[PDB]
Amino acid sequence: SMQINLNSTDPVPSKTPFSVSDADSYNKKGTVTVYDSQGNAHDMNVYFVK
């Protein structure tokens, strides 16, 4: 679960389309660490774009 709050007046990103390398291509980046069957950590990166 990821509870987030977003500012309504944030502008739409100018850099289309979404790119992992380009930070300006997304509004927000977050990270949540999940675990698999053998316990190895996967750093799920979640990108929010308007």
Next chain:
Amino acid sequence: SMQINLNSTDPVPSKTPFSVSDADSYNKKGTVTVYDSQGNAHDMNVYFVK
């Protein structure tokens, strides 16, 4: 609510009707910041013209 003081000696502007850009076209300008449902800041300009 808006509590303002109005002076009886203020003349009627010569450049009728009211013009937002023309300073001589209005007698008093005030600004009130309100919030909509999502809470964005809206600057209502209230103009008192005799």
